[PDB]
Design a protein around this ligand. Sequence first.
Ligand code: NI
Length: 283
Amino acid sequence: GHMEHRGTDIISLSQAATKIHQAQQTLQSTPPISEENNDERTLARQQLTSSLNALAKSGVSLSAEQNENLRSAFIWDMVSQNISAIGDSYLGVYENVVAVYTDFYQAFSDILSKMGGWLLPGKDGNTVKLDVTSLKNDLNSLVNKYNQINSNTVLFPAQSGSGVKVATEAEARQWLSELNLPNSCLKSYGSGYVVTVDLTPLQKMVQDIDGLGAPGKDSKLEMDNAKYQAWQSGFKAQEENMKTTLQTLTQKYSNANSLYDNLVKVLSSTISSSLETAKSFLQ
Ligand code: NI
């Protein structure tokens, strides 16, 4: 127990520092906006935990101060276990939530991009014509698409290659609460439950469109500028509800990512302190 081996300690600790820094760089720079991106982020965490498993076997020893910093923040196999669970069951869920919501929101944006063409000149300068039918049909089609249960719609659990992965009612309700989503997002499927995208603003938009009254023979609705403007304000309010939902989720994702990163910093600080120790010697 008297044979020192600074050289090999320095090599092992530097190897771990490097792998952790690379994973951290990926998790800080790669947005969770596509399946490809989240595959890269998941692989980065796999790389980080493999590095800790390797470090655990290396023979590097920790001080009493370091052992304690680690126990409290989260021995090396306990650390790897705890960080693995958070990456998989907390951050990985949030990544899925953002990627699914991103593509849903894009589908909505694509509809909004058509609205210019659905607003026509009226009979005079005090009236407009809104193509209420084309707008309602496109919104309804979106609702129908995202009311299904599949990999395009399910926020939790994150889905794999086959079937529909479901959770117990209690597990799904916990995430519903965690995400601050309305009750309508909680759905039974087969043997359990999933949490899906919020369709309420879309459904309200359609209601408010029918609220305007029946279209004319052309399938469109003539309206005075005041009525149109009042309708548009209400429509924009529903767009703001969807924007707000997405904002809450992306912020919550960022904070989940920051919580993991804070644990990564603890790892990096621990390893840097060991490296100092391996390089240091009392006069
Ligand atoms: Ni010895």
